[PDB]
Design a protein around this ligand. Structure first.
Ligand SMILES: OC[C@H]1O[C@@H](O[C@H]2[C@H](O)[C@H](O)[C@H](O[C@H]3[C@H](O)[C@H](O)[C@H](O[C@H]4[C@H](O)[C@H](O)[C@H](O[C@H]5[C@H](O)[C@H](O)[C@H](O[C@H]6[C@H](O)[C@H](O)[C@H](O)O[C@@H]6CO)O[C@@H]5CO)O[C@@H]4CO)O[C@@H]3CO)O[C@@H]2CO)[C@@H](O)[C@@H](O)[C@@H]1O
Length: 159
């Protein structure tokens, strides 16, 4: 099976931090696909650098951060280490992602989040659509019972 459930100690505390730090159920769904622990403690930049570098609980990339958020408006590729603040500031992390999606719109945001600058030029590939559909499924699972907003259940999808 390409999707399912698992129980992760501490997840509910993370879900409630997200929902109490400006996040909605939609942000939770994206974050839940990004990491198992709703955390930022994957390797720095997810092992990537400059525009590809991933930061925050959604693993937003620096290209998206510098082009579409008020926190990083107008910054350069070389300034990519400036995104690291999102690894410790959840409020700004969520606000950045929400702003990013409002700048690009959901379609474009999905493409540029999933595939960087290249995704903006081809936003409806099968891979981006699959990622979109997985996030939608996870959101549907979380929305199906309020207990999933505070328990330790993770809904995962293999994209
Ligand atoms: O413009 C700059 C250049 O950008 C390039 O594009 C980049 C882009 O900049 C950015 O770096 C982007 O980064 C992606 C990244 O590639 C990746 O997709 C990432 O998404 C992850 C996350 O890292 C984890 O890998 C996560 O893993 C979860 C699994 O999906 C799954 O849910 C799993 O569940 C399992 C379960 O736990 C249990 O074990 C069960 O038994 O089995 C299940 C199945 O495994 O749990 C995992 C979590 O632990 O998946 C997500 C999603 O895939 O997110 C970012 C996107 O934000 O990459 C692109 C490059 O592709 C280019 O455009 C370049 O041209 C530019 O110059």
């Amino acid at each position: 099976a390409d999707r399912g459930t698992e129980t992760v100690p501490g997840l509910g505390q993370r879900k409630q931090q997200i929902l109490n730090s400006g996040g909605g159920v939609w942000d939770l769904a994206i974050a839940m696909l990004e990491t198992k622990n709703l955390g930022t403690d994957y390797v720095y930049g997810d092992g990537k650098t400059y525009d590809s570098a991933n930061f925050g609980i959604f693993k937003q990339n620096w290209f998206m951060l510098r082009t579409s958020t008020s926190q990083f408006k107008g910054q350069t590729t070389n300034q990519w280490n400036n995104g690291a603040v999102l690894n410790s500031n959840l409020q700004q992390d969520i606000k950045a992602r929400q702003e990013s999606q409002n700048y690009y719109g959901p379609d474009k945001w999905f493409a540029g989040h999933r595939n960087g600058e290249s995704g903006l030029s081809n936003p409806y590939t099968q891979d981006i659509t699959n990622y979109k559909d997985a996030v939608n499924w996870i959101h549907d699972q979380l929305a199906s019972d309020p207990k999933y907003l505070s328990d330790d259940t993770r809904f995962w999808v293999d994209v």
